[PDB]
Symmetry: C4
Subunit: 91 residues, 4 copies
């Protein structure tokens, strides 16, 4: 259940990082940052894709990735955080 | 169910793209990018509407579009992704 | 139900617009834009509060406003949009 | 219930503020602003981490903090706002 969504999102973040460092010429660490702030809908205030290929990629990358990247956070906050921090409140 | 929300959001993204390329003078591919990052609440870190008409349009475009654009992602992640990737885990 | 949340969010957006045009020196139409992109979590890619008073105001303005501003969109998309566009699909 | 999530998020915002003022060289009030706009997914349109350590920290800080920071807003809008403003509508 939780170990499946953990890999589905890693494959999704590794896909983004490979695309932006290649088409947009960004350093790998930067392309993983832009990819993460997008699927989480935080967004980057300094960089926006400057190629026609990047603009179209980001649009389709949002509608596909936000469903699962946000689907893992829901499982990562209710499977691991809730019970662990909850079962912690027993003195 | 899912084929209805697919067209409701396309009509909503085509509406945005036509407005920003005309009032703000943006190239069409850019206006579709700004329109997508808004309804998904990602946001663009380089461009903000520079006309009084664009500022008011974006405000009303957010409160109307975010309800359905996010209503399709919910259906696109539970109707197509969940069962397909789930039914995939059968060896 | 829906007419109550409609005024709760207007009072919340009118509060933001009055604060940023005064403390940050923004034109009123700009302060209403920055206030809307914040409570909806879209965010503005050109302006960030440049006064210590504005930085603290925005933080507390997010945790209080996002609960209701997003609580109206939920009602505005299920009370008015769902049944209207749904009852529309009857030929 | 609500007093537990109130401290879990303060510890989470105090963690962010200490990291960005130190690694990125930001003034404390600025690091608390960047930390708040991130966990709420608003995002800052002027600053993005400029060190390799900051870029990696922000990525892991998003996936851990957004689950609880958004889990408190849900409780802060349904435990305190709903009944208070609702019980207010009795003349
Ligand atoms: Na969001
Ligand atoms: Na954002
Ligand atoms: Na943003
Ligand atoms: Na700039
Ligand atoms: Na957002
Ligand atoms: Na900028």
């Amino acid at each position: 259940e939780f170990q499946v969504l953990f890999v589905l999102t890693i494959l999704t973040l590794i896909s983004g990082t490979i695309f932006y460092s290649t088409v947009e010429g960004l350093r790998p660490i930067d392309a993983l940052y832009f990819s993460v702030v997008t699927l989480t809908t935080v967004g980057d205030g300094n960089f926006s894709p400057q190629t026609d290929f990047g603009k179209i990629f980001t649009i389709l990358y949002i509608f596909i990735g936000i469903g699962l990247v946000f689907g893992f956070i829901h499982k990562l906050a209710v499977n691991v955080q809730l019970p662990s921090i909850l079962s912690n409140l027993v003195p």
